């Protein structure tokens, strides 16, 4: 009776049971295998580790990240992750539950079949379904039409959705997201007089980012304030107790989203990318995109991002056009929550792909149950 919802991000996998309001399991999308084939004073039988213990045992393992930029690049590694998710994390029997999986926008048709092959042939699922991540965000906020900007660890997308379906032609991919900011934050702190470089120092910066960074409504004016007073300054409590002082870096960091030239990127800016997608849609539905611009993914979590978006898009739009930005406080797990709502609706119960349907049609049935 209870469905499983598995949202596979580049950074973190989020897993749990449909109907819950949050995932039970959140862990790094990392598979680790022992370097050196045969030999070891390794352990029991474990030819693989997933998530945190792979991270803990980095020193004996070669680590892989199977889902780079939202797209799977190794199905063997991906299978290790799903295996870990069902048995180690949720502790359920795959063959007992229908399972809903997510995918990145513009996911190659090959991969969509592979996802379905593995779910039925490897994990013997009674039923399953595949959903575009961005679409689930929109659903989570009670909408079926709108544009969502979904920005995570590895990639960002603006995705125009009309009446339940993503519009492939107007999907823009922005090759900039969370880890470009982590890196950028390291750069500007180094400049200040501190030093972060080692992949453990990274994880420290990443914590600062998620805790202290924010978006200023007026960036220039905020730079002016930070330069002529120490009122914006905060000091961060490190592990080894070295209390570090961070000023205008707090807001110059998320600013990169709006001014990718800060990253040596000639690219566009989240607000302008959003505008360009809206413009790629038919004149007659644009209004609905404007009035329903949804934010999702950890990288949209900076306080002040919504009002700024609102202002930046209004500056690009026509007059009087109703620009509404939806940034719910839970938006980090909007994709998952959306998944949870959908799969737990009774009207969804016949939407599933059943084992029976797979046995006759094969991997390619997934195309018929989507776009």
């Amino acid at each position: 009776v209870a469905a499983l919802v598995v949202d596979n991000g580049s950074g973190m996998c989020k897993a749990g049971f449909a109907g819950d309001d949050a995932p039970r399991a959140v862990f790094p999308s990392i598979v680790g295998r022992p370097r050196h084939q045969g030999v070891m004073v390794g352990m029991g039988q474990k030819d693989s580790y997933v998530g945190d213990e792979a991270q803990s045992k980095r020193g004996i393992l070669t680590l892989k990240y199977p889902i780079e930029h939202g797209i799977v690049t190794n199905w063997d590694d991906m299978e290790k992750i799903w295996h870990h998710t069902f048995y180690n994390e949720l502790r359920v029997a795959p063959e007992e539950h229908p399972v809903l999986l997510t995918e990145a926008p513009l996911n190659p048709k090959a991969n969509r079949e592979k996802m379905t092959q593995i779910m039925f042939e490897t994990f013997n699922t009674p039923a399953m379904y595949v959903a575009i991540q961005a679409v689930l965000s929109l659903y989570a906020s009670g909408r079926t039409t709108g544009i969502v900007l979904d920005s995570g660890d590895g990639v960002s997308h603006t995705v125009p959705i009309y009446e339940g379906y993503a519009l492939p032609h107007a999907i823009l991919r922005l090759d900039l997201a969370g880890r470009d900011l982590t890196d950028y934050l390291m750069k500007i702190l180094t400049e200040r007089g501190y030093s972060f470089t080692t992949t453990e120092e990274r994880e420290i910066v990443r914590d600062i980012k998620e805790k202290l960074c924010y978006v200023a409504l007026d960036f220039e004016q905020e730079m002016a304030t930070a330069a002529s007073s120490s009122s914006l300054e905060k000091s961060y409590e490190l592990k080894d107790g070295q209390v570090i002082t961070i000023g205008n870096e707090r807001f110059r960091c998320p600013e990169a989203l709006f001014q990718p030239s800060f990253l040596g990127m000639e690219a566009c800016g989240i607000h302008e990318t959003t505008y360009n997608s809206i413009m790629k849609c038919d004149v007659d539905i644009r209004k609905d995109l404007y009035a329903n611009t949804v934010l999702s993914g950890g990288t949209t979590m900076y306080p002040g991002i919504a009002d700024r978006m609102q202002k930046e898009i209004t500056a690009l739009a026509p007059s009087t056009m109703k620009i509404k930005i939806i940034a719910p406080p839970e938006r980090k797990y909007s994709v998952w929550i959306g998944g949870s709502i959908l799969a737990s609706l009774s009207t969804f119960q016949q939407m599933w792909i059943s084992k029976q349907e797979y046995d006759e049609s094969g991997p390619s049935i997934v195309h018929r149950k989507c776009f």
Binding site: D21, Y139, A327, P328, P329
Partner: protein
């Protein structure tokens, strides 16, 4: 229709986080909520906004008996008891 009903169920039916197991039942506002668990960054974000919001200029024009005297900088009629 099979589709039409689901679309209605996403909008209509509890298409919201009234799901289960410790959530946010009710929330309000004028717009939305750019936010994280760290209330420090939130306040920084709020104060930066107050400083950055444009004047009355940016606001929705209204025709009030009083506010009329505001759009014409200095005016007056009956001020206070």
């Amino acid at each position: 229709s099979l589709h039409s009903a689901l679309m209605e169920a996403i909008h209509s039916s509890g298409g919201r986080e009234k799901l289960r197991k410790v959530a946010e039942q009710t929330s309000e506002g004028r717009p939305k909520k750019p936010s994280y668990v760290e209330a420090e960054s939130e306040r920084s974000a709020l104060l930066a906004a107050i400083r950055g919001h444009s004047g009355t200029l940016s606001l929705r024009k209204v025709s009030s008996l009083a506010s009329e005297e505001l759009q014409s900088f200095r005016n007056a009629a009956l001020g206070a008891p």
